[PDB]
Amino acid sequence: GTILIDLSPDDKEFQSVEEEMQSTVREHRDGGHAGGIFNRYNILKIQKVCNKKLWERYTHRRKEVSEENHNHANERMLFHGSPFVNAIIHKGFDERHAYIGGMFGAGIYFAENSSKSNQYVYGIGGGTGCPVHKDRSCYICHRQLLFCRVTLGKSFLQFSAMMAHSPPGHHSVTGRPSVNGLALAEYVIYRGEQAYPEYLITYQIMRPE
């Protein structure tokens, strides 16, 4: 049921998504081990992901959450990187896309920092890097990320020193780095229907000059 619609680079929509990508790159405490060494991306393509069934699944859950949270969906646009990006855009998020060993519990994780999600494109810890070169810092191979609509509802705030159920009375967890003041938040949901993979971004990381 999914169709992908290319956005033109001359479109404000493309430009806004690229700006959110580029402006949320940060340095990581692993010195680039997982995601590579880079300060910016080369954006190759941005596609809108259209699936009526997955969209209706998402809005039905958003409505349930919104009503449970006194008419506040607390909806965000957040990044998600995963080796299962192809499966997600076709079948939606589900328990197979959860990070069982994540710090904030076994759920599906999303990032405000695009570079945080970039660390998971090739798997946990960057896996073995790109298929072709086995390089986690590969500047040649094409990567893909999702920029997703995520319903947080009542979110449990967990400060961090950097499929399960939600904390009782909560629909998500907000993981907020308390040591690195330039690190943005990470968010966890425990139901696949609380996210919709709205944009598919194809890119390369760029070698710093």
Ligand X SMILES: CC(C)(C)c1ccc(-c2nc3ccccc3c(=O)[nH]2)cc1
Report the binding-site residues. Answer: 130, 133, 138, 141
Sole window of 80-88, 123-131, 169-177, 192-200 interacting with Zn ion (rule: CB under 5 A): 123-131
Q: Is 62 in the site for ligand X (CB under 6 A)?
A: no
From the CB of 192, what's the least distance to Zn ion, in Å?
Answer: 30
From the CB of 122, what's the least distance to Zn ion, in Å?
Answer: 10
Q: Which of 60, 90, 133, 207 binds Zn ion (CB under 5 A)?
A: 133
In the sheet that holds 172-177, the strands lie side by side as 3-6, 41-50, 195-205, 143-151, 75-80, 108-111, 186-189, 172-177, 155-160
From the CB of 47, what's the least distance to Zn ion, in Å?
Answer: 22
Q: Is 81 in the site for ligand X (CB under 6 A)?
A: yes
Contact string 6-45 vs ligand X (x = CB under 6 A): ----------------------------------------
Q: Give one DSSP letter per residue of 71-125, joined into a string.
A: S---EEEEEE--TTHHHHHHH---GGG-BTT-TT-SBEEEESSHHHHHTTTTSGG
The pairing of beta strand 143-151 with beta strand 195-205? antiparallel
Q: Is 120 in the site for ligand X (CB under 6 A)?
A: yes
Q: Measured between alpha carbons, how far is 119 from 187 in angstroms, rounded to an integer? A: 15
From the CB of 63, what's the least distance to ligand X, in Å?
Answer: 25
